[PDB]
């Protein structure tokens, strides 16, 4: 009765629809896709080090 009237009038006559994405963007974390951080490189290329290590390292006792 009064319930119905209140229900009918309020519900019918008051309609909402969700807010714009732009406003939403403000309230959320936006995200710009992560890049590739690093491209690895050759592992100590050149026998300069290698020759040094082969000759230098021995450390054997008598």
């Amino acid at each position: 009765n009064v319930i119905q009237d209140l229900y009918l009038r309020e519900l019918k006559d008051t309609k909402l629809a969700p807010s714009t994405l732009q406003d939403a963007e403000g309230n959320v974390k936006p995200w710009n896709p992560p890049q590739k951080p690093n491209l690895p490189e050759l592992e100590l290329q050149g026998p300069e080090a290698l020759k040094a290590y082969t000759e230098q390292n021995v450390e054997t006792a008598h």
Partner: protein
């Protein structure tokens, strides 16, 4: 045995008055005469208001009682014994209280149902009559007790109506419905 005990403090006095006047047989006479002296106590404004408040002696109280029985020589003797009781208990601050209570017991003995139809505004006389009819039609009226319909104005009870009588009420006020609607629509 009274027509259902109600009221402890002061109402043991009322109960006693009732049952004693049941043994007097004349309860209506007692009540009517009490009503008349009570009314002239209220319509005595100097000291019939300003000496309803104990501050004076037992002996002085007794002499006030003596003045009261000069004011009416019709008061039965049981309600004159009631005057004795109240003077002896030196409690005058519950004289009209006892009067009201005796009225409740008395009109219970007479058998008159009591009720009220509180609303936001005074209702139509057609509404009053329809409600009076309805209440008599309802099993609530035992045909032995005849409702009082008292309209009360209570805007705080926003719209609707609430019917009350016995320990049974139907509350179809607007305020309660709004309250519930809102509350559940906060859920």
């Amino acid at each position: 045995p009274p027509p259902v005990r109600l009221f402890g403090v002061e109402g043991t006095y009322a109960t006693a008055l009732y049952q004693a006047a049941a043994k007097n047989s004349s309860i209506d006479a007692a009540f009517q005469s009490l009503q008349k002296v009570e009314s002239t106590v209220k319509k005595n404004p100097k000291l019939g208001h300003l000496l309803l408040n104990p501050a004076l002696s037992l002996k002085d109280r007794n002499s006030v009682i003596d003045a009261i029985v000069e004011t009416h020589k019709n008061l039965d003797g049981y309600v004159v014994n009631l005057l004795k009781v109240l003077s002896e208990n030196n409690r005058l601050g519950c004289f009209e209280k006892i009067a009201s209570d005796f009225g409740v017991l008395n009109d219970a003995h007479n058998g008159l149902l009591k009720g009220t139809v509180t609303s936001a505004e005074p209702l139509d006389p057609k509404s009053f009559k329809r409600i009076e009819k309805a209440l008599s039609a309802s099993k609530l009226v035992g045909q032995g007790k005849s409702l009082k319909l008292e309209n009360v104005v209570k805007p705080e009870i926003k719209g609707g109506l609430i019917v009350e009588l016995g320990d049974k009420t139907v509350d179809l006020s607007i305020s309660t419905k709004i309250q519930k609607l809102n509350k559940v629509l906060e859920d």
